Amino acid sequence: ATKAVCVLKGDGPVQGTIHFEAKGDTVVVTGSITGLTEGDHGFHVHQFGDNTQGCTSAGPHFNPLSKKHGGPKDEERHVGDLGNVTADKNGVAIVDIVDPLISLSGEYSIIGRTMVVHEKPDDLGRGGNEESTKTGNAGSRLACGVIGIAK
Amino acid sequence: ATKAVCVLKGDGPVQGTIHFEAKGDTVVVTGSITGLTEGDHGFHVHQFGDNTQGCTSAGPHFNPLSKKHGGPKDEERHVGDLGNVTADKNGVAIVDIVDPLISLSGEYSIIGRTMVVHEKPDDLGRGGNEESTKTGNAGSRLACGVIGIAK
Numbered sequence: 250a251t252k253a254v255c256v257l258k259g260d261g262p263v264q265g266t267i268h269f270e271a272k273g274d275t276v277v278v279t280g281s282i283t284g285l286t287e288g289d290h291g292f293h294v295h296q297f298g299d300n301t302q303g304c305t306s307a308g309p310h311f312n313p314l315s316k317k318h319g320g321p322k323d324e325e326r327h328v329g330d331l332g333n334v335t336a337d338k339n340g341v342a343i344v345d346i347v348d349p350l351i352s353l354s355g356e357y358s359i360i361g362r363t364m365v366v367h368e369k370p371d372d373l374g375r376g377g378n379e380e381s382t383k384t385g386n387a388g389s390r391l392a393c394g395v396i397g398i399a400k
Numbered sequence: 401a402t403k404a405v406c407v408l409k410g411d412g413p414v415q416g417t418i419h420f421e422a423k424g425d426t427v428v429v430t431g432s433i434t435g436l437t438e439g440d441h442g443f444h445v446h447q448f449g450d451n452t453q454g455c456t457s458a459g460p461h462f463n464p465l466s467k468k469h470g471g472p473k474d475e476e477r478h479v480g481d482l483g484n485v486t487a488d489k490n491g492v493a494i495v496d497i498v499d500p501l502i503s504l505s506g507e508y509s510i511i512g513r514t515m516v517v518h519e520k521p522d523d524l525g526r527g528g529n530e531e532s533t534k535t536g537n538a539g540s541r542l543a544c545g546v547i548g549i550a551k
């Protein structure tokens with residue numbers, strides 16, 4: 250697959266549609282998320298596309314190379330660490346990220362896994378607390394969706 | 401992936417959880433669906449895991465070998481043709497299917513695609529009109545979900 254789509258939904262007001270497109274060796278992630286409190290929000294690909302217990306059964310960040318949590322520009326990061334999205338005053342986060350590590354096929358494929366938008370901003374593993382190196386202290390999962398193959 | 405899961409949800413009361421497990425060289429589909437009218441309901445894997453327009457954006461039956469619609473035991477069938485699930489008097493359908501054409505990896509992988517439960521019985525491509533050769537006359541999509549990787 251070369252195109253993917255994710256519909257984020259949660260127990261609250263956060264909702265959004267993310268599109269993924271394979272462009273050479275990068276994946277271009279676009280879309281918008283709304284109902285977010287203005288500010289930065291942790292945006293990551295969790296390991297399982299299991300929504301049987303809402304966003305909790307999505308597990309941890311997709312980390313096939315068992316690295317520490319980082320930000321997207323870092324080398325030592327989880328494959329799912331896409332950093333943060335920023336909600337404007339109206340709660341609207343417009344997504345536009347280009348990542349060279351997540352993929353739509355092969356081993357790092359994220360098809361079938363879950364996109365999660367969090368409550369607080371991802372500290373990018375620079376928080377000086379152990380939690381920071383595991384989840385970036387992004388807190389609760391507001392909305393999530395399974396990533397599926399798109400036309 | 402050797403395990404997958406799908407949460408079916410729609411606009412009505414139909415809902416359920418379907419689990420998929422690669423056991424040997426085959427795929428075992430289990431789970432239960434509730435909220436259904438008594439009787440048979442078409443149950444198929446649709447091509448796209450695109451829930452942006454509800455179950456409508458799932459596209460047609462997954463059909464990589466370009467065949468016509470059939471029942472699960474037919475040679476001429478789409479890969480996504482899982483036949484009918486049957487709901488009892490309380491609207492509960494118990495799913496137990498072993499299928500030789502779907503898989504959880506490779507060309508016949510259903511990860512990232514959508515599982516749909518339909519309003520009417522699937523006629524297994526034997527109804528005699530053109531629609532029977534496409535969808536089995538199974539009608540509208542009552543509930544659907546993107547198939548994701550499970551732990």
Ligand SMILES: [Ca+2]
Pocket residue numbers: 368369387388389
């Ligand atoms: Ca929190």
Ligand SMILES: [Ca+2]
Pocket residue numbers: 519520538539540
């Ligand atoms: Ca119908």
Ligand SMILES: [Cu+2]
Pocket residue numbers: 291292293294295310365367384387
């Ligand atoms: Cu996360």
Ligand SMILES: [Cu+2]
Pocket residue numbers: 442443444445446461516518535538
């Ligand atoms: Cu169908």
Ligand SMILES: [Zn+2]
Pocket residue numbers: 293310317318319326327329330383384385
């Ligand atoms: Zn991480």
Ligand SMILES: [Zn+2]
Pocket residue numbers: 444461468469470477478480481534535536
């Ligand atoms: Zn079919």
